[PDB]
Design a protein. Structure first.
Lengths: 217, 221
């Protein structure tokens, strides 16, 4: 069978906590020489995967003593003592011997205190207007938890269509999240209304955070 | 210093094939197994196969037999991977990595990765729009500025501020695809004492269309 199964898929943890990630093989994987070629790799957003541990318990250069590997036969474990903000990312176990195989990965995420988003709204640039388009942009930065919804208002009227949302990966320093929301309209449409509003509904308030502008400024 | 340099982003049509490279330097190319890994979003990491450059002996995962073909040229210390009969399932970031022995037994060094997009959509350069606050009354001690990057294909685009000197307080959001066109954005928050007093420019690079776009953020009205 020799598939590598990781538990769990997602590992939410608070700073200072102990993190434990399991990796089980469907068959014993010790090589004939008595050595077990089981490694752990970490991949952070925007970077290449990188080596943490090899031959079950050996730490690679530049890796914090906080990362420790153990296990035998079919059960292997990567332990991160005293989790820190920059430890977030996707951890993967990997069998390096015949038919090298990756486990499915475990995404380590940080749990922290709530934080309200810093909201900024922007009118369409004159350049885009020239091309006949009109995108209104809103940034909701450095907030927590990740769950949040945006509400666009045009002259007080709610608008849901034509909105494009994107969220950043969790911040490795402050552990917060940020999101961008772009409402794209046609120049003609944009020109018929005056008030544009960006509103965020996050559990850090019973009353959303509103930000807006008038095509009159 | 061990280095693995991979070739650039590729946009290939369904059914076609692509051949990418991994130039090795800083060690004896022929003494180590070179490995190839697939990184498709939502799939994790997948082992494709490996080649021993010294004699080109290869071993492949069953899933990639007949899909991937690994080669190597010792005179140029370069390893290659050709992917054939491309489908959208082959759109991914592909890495090469060296398998070490002695001081370590694992993939210790990795290339920066080669992004591949399989699609029949046309290449389009990025439309870059500067984002300045609508009013002066919407500017306090700190000011957030931005750049909206629309209508480009294929990904990726890279964004910097003031040629990289402005790195603090930056948020560059993942690109989102909509009808064969990508959209991404980047915000940067700076002291009102520095802007518009000092210039702030976002720099956008789109190697896939060999284009670079610089847009200065200036106050509206």
């Amino acid at each position: 069978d020799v598939l590598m199964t990781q538990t769990p898929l997602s590992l939410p943890v608070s700073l200072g906590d102990q993190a434990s990630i399991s990796c089980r093989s469907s068959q014993n994987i010790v090589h004939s020489n008595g050595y077990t070629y089981l490694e752990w790799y970490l991949q952070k957003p925007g970077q290449s995967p990188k080596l943490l541990i090899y031959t079950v318990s050996n730490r690679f250069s530049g890796v914090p003593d906080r990362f420790s590997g153990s296990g035998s036969g079919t059960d292997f474990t990567l332990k991160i003592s005293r989790v820190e903000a920059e430890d977030l990312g996707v951890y993967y176990c990997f069998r390096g011997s015949h038919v090298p195989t990756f486990g499915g990965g475990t995404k380590l995420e940080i749990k922290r205190a709530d934080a309200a988003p810093t909201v900024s709204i922007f009118p369409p640039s004159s350049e885009q207007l020239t091309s006949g388009g009109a995108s209104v942009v809103c940034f909701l930065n450095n907030f927590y938890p990740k769950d949040i919804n945006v509400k666009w208002k045009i002259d007080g009227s709610e608008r849901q269509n034509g909105v494009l949302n994107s969220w950043t990966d969790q911040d490795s320093k402050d552990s917060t999240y940020s999101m961008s929301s772009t409402l794209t309209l046609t120049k003609d449409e944009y020109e018929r209304h005056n008030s544009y509003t960006c509103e965020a509904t996050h559990k850090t308030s019973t009353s959303p955070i509103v930000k807006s502008f008038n095509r009159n400024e | 210093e061990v280095q693995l340099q991979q070739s650039g982003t590729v946009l290939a049509r369904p059914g076609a094939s692509v051949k990418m490279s991994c130039k090795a330097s800083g060690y004896t190319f022929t003494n180590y197994w070179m490995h190839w890994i697939k990184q498709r979003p939502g799939q994790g990491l997948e082992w494709i196969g490996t080649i021993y450059p010294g004699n080109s002996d290869t071993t492949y995962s069953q899933k990639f037999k007949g899909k991937a073909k690994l080669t190597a040229v010792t005179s140029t210390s370069t390893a290659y991977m050709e992917l054939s009969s491309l489908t959208n399932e082959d759109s991914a970031v592909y890495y090469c990595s060296r398998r070490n022995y002695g001081s370590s037994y694992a993939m210790d060094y990795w290339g920066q990765g080669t992004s591949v997009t399989v699609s029949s959509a046309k290449t389009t350069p990025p439309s870059v729009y500067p984002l300045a606050p609508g009013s002066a009354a919407q500017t306090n001690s700190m000011v957030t500025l931005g750049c909206l990057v629309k209508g480009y294909f294929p990904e990726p685009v890279t964004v910097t501020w003031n040629s990289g000197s402005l790195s603090s307080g930056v948020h560059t959001f993942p690109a989102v695809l909509q009808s064969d066109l990508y959209t991404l954005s980047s915000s940067v928050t700076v002291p009102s004492s520095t802007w518009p007093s000092e210039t702030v420019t976002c720099n956008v690079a789109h190697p896939a269309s060999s284009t670079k776009v610089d847009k200065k953020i200036v106050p509206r009205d």
